[PDB]
Amino acid sequence: QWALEDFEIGRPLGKGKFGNVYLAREKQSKFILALKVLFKAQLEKAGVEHQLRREVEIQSHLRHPNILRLYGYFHDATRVYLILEYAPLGTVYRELQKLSKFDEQRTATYITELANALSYCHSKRVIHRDIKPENLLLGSAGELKIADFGWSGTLDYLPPEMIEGRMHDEKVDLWSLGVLCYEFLVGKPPFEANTYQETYKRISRVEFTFPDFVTEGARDLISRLLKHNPSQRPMLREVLEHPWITANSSK
Numbered sequence: 001q002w003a004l005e006d007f008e009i010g011r012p013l014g015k016g017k018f019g020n021v022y023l024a025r026e027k028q029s030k031f032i033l034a035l036k037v038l039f040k041a042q043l044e045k046a047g048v049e050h051q052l053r054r055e056v057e058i059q060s061h062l063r064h065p066n067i068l069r070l071y072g073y074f075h076d077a078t079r080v081y082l083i084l085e086y087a088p089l090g091t092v093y094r095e096l097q098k099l100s101k102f103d104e105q106r107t108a109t110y111i112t113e114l115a116n117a118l119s120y121c122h123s124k125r126v127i128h129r130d131i132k133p134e135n136l137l138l139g140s141a142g143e144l145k146i147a148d149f150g151w152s153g154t155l156d157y158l159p160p161e162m163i164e165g166r167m168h169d170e171k172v173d174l175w176s177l178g179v180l181c182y183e184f185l186v187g188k189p190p191f192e193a194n195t196y197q198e199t200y201k202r203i204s205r206v207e208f209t210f211p212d213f214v215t216e217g218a219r220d221l222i223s224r225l226l227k228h229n230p231s232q233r234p235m236l237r238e239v240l241e242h243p244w245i246t247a248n249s250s251k
């Protein structure tokens with residue numbers, strides 16, 4: 001049983017459509033964490049946000065070093081509160097804008113962290129279909145943390161099966177992994193274009209190319225992951241064992 005009076009509120013970390021996220025601290029022990037405040041009146045209008053409740057139930061039973069922890073939640077008369085693990089280094093997206101693009105060691109280490117996390121999720125019957133840089137946070141040691149932002153995803157990261165209105169499964173996560181590996185190395189997504197229509201067309205036809213600096217091992221992995229036919233994509237164990245991943249990962 002938590003209470004608002006148990007925390008000291010600090011600076012705003014980000015803004016959303018149903019409330020904000022603040023840096024906070026437990027008064028007594030002085031423990032740093034993140035607090036998200038949502039307004040009921042807002043939830044019960046944008047839809048029947050019982051979705052929040054299901055998502056909170058699901059997220060609170062996941063324990064992995066590469067998945068952001070939901071420590072708990074409570075509510076009062078007008079607000080609902082989520083107590084979250086704090087990520088000191090911020091978003092991967094912000095880090096990407098600063099460096100322009102990552103080198104092979106950093107990229108390979110990140111892909112390894114995500115495959116492990118996605119593997120644990122699949123065994124828990126949890127499939128994302130979403131995992132943008134903006135939604136990837138960094139811990140104290142620089143480790144990746146997967147957060148739950150789309151609990152309520154532009155075209156760039158969507159797989160062919162989806163925009164083509166077919167049925168999907170856990171194979172969408174392999175596609176996402178390919179788009180991300182590419183964006184990390186090149187600096188931008190593989191199907192980006194001036195119009196929505198052209199992007200839709202390139203994804204469906206799987207039309208993309210690599211800049212000259214991209215390595216052959218990197219091209220190999222990404223070409224295997226971005227397969228039109230979902231069943232032609234490798235298992236997560238095959239990604240963790242790919243020669244390019246093994247050679248450049250710092251472990």
Ligand SMILES: COc1cc2c(Nc3cnc(NC(=O)c4ccccc4)nc3)ncnc2cc1OC[C@@H](O)CN1CCCCC1
Nearest residue numbers: 013014021034055056059085086087088089090147148151
């Ligand atoms: C972008 O800035 C942030 C968002 C965060 C954040 N956001 C977040 C919001 N919502 C959720 N979750 C949910 O909405 C949810 C819903 C249902 C069920 C479960 C979870 N998870 C994480 N969580 C934790 N830490 C965060 C840190 C953030 O920024 C950190 C920087 O400032 C620190 N700064 C320090 C100095 C150098 C530069 C970086």
